[PDB]
Design a binder for this molecule. Sequence first.
Ligand SMILES: [Cl-]
Ligand SMILES: [Cl-]
Ligand SMILES: [Cl-]
Ligand SMILES: [K+]
Ligand SMILES: [K+]
Lengths: 74, 74
Amino acid sequence: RRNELKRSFFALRDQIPELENNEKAPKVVILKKATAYILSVQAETQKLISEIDLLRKQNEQLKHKLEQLRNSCA
Amino acid sequence: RRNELKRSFFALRDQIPELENNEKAPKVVILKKATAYILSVQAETQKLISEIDLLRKQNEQLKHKLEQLRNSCA
Ligand SMILES: [Cl-]
Ligand SMILES: [Cl-]
Ligand SMILES: [Cl-]
Ligand SMILES: [K+]
Ligand SMILES: [K+]
């Protein structure tokens, strides 16, 4: 119904930090800023993934150095 | 413009993985899947942050062991 459409616009609006609980936010703004927010959080996801990849590489290098020194301690 | 409103529904649809871009999704379906996708991504972001925090701890523990061996090996 149209109750459900209004309800669903509110619920989407409220996952967008810039628009949460803004009673003056119109439909087209909610749709476009939601689309923008999805892209923005994907960008942040990519940064986190890159950070993990770097930490894993560092983890592997450290473990390699640890093994080398354990075998070279005398 | 209701032309812009329609375009904006479709552009949001296009960013939602579980909605096929070649299929005409109802308005409430687009809204609800967008909301679900944003919540799901935010949860995954928290999981990525926890992975990063664990890797940083693991890497500090490895550096600590490397320091101990450098100090105590011959
Ligand atoms: Cl409106
Ligand atoms: Cl519809
Ligand atoms: Cl609908
Ligand atoms: K609310
Ligand atoms: K040595």
